[PDB]
Amino acid sequence: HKILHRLLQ
Amino acid sequence: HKILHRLLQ
Amino acid sequence: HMLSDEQMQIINSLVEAHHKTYDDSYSDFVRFRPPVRRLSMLPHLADLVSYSIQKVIGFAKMIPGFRDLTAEDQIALLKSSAIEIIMLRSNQSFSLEDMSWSCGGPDFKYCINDVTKAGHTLELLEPLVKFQVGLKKLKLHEEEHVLLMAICLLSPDRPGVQDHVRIEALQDRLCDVLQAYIRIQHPGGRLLYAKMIQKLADLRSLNEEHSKQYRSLSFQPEHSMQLTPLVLEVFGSEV
Amino acid sequence: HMLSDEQMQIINSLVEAHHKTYDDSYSDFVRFRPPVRRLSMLPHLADLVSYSIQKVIGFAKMIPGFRDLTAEDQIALLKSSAIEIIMLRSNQSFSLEDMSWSCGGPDFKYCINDVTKAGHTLELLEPLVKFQVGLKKLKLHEEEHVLLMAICLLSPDRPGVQDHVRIEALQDRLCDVLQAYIRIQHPGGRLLYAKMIQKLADLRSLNEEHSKQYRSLSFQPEHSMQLTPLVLEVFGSEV
Ligand SMILES: C[C@H](CCCC(C)(C)O)[C@@H]1CCCC[C@H]2/C(=C/C=C3C[C@@H](O)C[C@H](O)C3)CCC[C@@]21C
Ligand SMILES: C[C@H](CCCC(C)(C)O)[C@@H]1CCCC[C@H]2/C(=C/C=C3C[C@@H](O)C[C@H](O)C3)CCC[C@@]21C
Known about the structure:
- The complex is a heterotetramer, with 2 copies of chain A and 2 copies of chain C.
- By secondary structure, chain A is mainly α.
- In chain A, about 65% of the residues lie in helices and about 0% in strands.
- Chain A has one helix spanning about 1-5.
- In chain C, a hairpin with a 6-residue loop joins strand 1 (about 100) and strand 2.
- Chains in contact: A-C, A-D, B-C, B-D, C-D.
- One ligand IFU binds near residues 46, 101, 118 and 231 of chain C.
- Chains A, B: This is Nuclear receptor coactivator 2.
- Chains A, B: It comes from Homo sapiens.
């Protein structure tokens, strides 16, 4: 979930 | 390596 | 009767958040991989979906109370609902006059033959367009469309969620706003709240069919290599 | 002295394979995500690299004897050598007159400021271009350029390989062809075989610097999401 997690700031 | 493997037919 | 201050700000917040994450000019579509008309449309449509996922996450982070759930539930609600929110938001571009999504010129006018050129069968396309013409006929105000999106995202019946209580509470505060809004600012629709909740069940079924066809695609490596990293993360099983 | 029949067919096979996988018109570049001139060039250049990886795999599958290695060694040789073959093949588009790669018009003319707009520092760019002008000055025939690519791919000093004997044998049959070719069909270069083998060491060092900077990029999720699935597979650790 790397990207999704960062995209949720 | 799913894609690389298929790309080597 | 009336809306309270808190139901006001929730409407204000969801409408602003939608305007910040939906561009009616579709001008970023010129940054995608171009369309081609063997699955020729798949790179452009993968880019489009991937762009839209970034937008729904933005909407999501601005839904009052969403930011308060744990990171797990936010990811859990986003992975399973994104395709449904994308189908909802895409109603803003769906024209009855041609049954296509008209995001610009002949380039970004997506008809039914372009969806099939992205590796999707009529089993998905046939109820998807019927959902679009059914949704379009409702002639929803801006506030109802945006309330429907947030209610959809906040369904507690999604795989992964753990705060069944906290997210079921937000989704009900949101339905309370939508039910109030229709009472105050929408005559000519006593069953409008029922036909909308109806659409949420329609989406559950469209979500299933799309995720079945995606699963097949994501195991054909020559096709999964056409997707983006975001698409592969959001629609792939990763718990 | 002369080339044998077998050294002939190996030259014939590698030159045909290169013509099948290198398009001097760069016409598929209009299918990439367009360039932008915050890392604006990264989507276009990721697409370009990803396209080039598909091409090197094609070249690889047509190198006589490569198809005979196990699938593991083919993957092992391709994952660690691809960036080097891409740097080699990109010499065909590198112009001395402007120190850029000129793949078409002002759109696909990649200068030094565009490489940095793809998140790569001068530590990579400074020896990379010096490798390009050093390689360009060699004025290699078609056969030598293609023999150099195959020799590079077939280095037994790569992580993952298991048939140290079988791939070290192919790489030496290939050097024997290249050494013979220069003897027969290339006067004005007694050290040409030595300066070429020199370039293979130059690439080892460029490969290190690029894979260091890529590693940093692939852990910044906002950047890794700009890459393609092929790029992430070829350049990521997956044993
Ligand atoms: C078939 C294909 C997905 C294939 C890609 C994978 C492999 C991931 O399935 C779509 C099916 C349903 C979701 C959104 C659909 C549409 C959205 C339109 C929008 C334009 C504007 O309204 C802004 C919106 O955010 C998106 C209409 C065209 C069809 C798709 C893209
Ligand atoms: C910096 C960037 C990679 C950034 C993307 C990640 C994140 C994966 O590092 C490249 C660095 C060195 C490899 C090839 C370079 C070039 C190749 C040119 C070719 C055109 C034609 O000759 C056909 C060839 O196959 C490719 C010149 C421009 C720079 C790149 C693309």
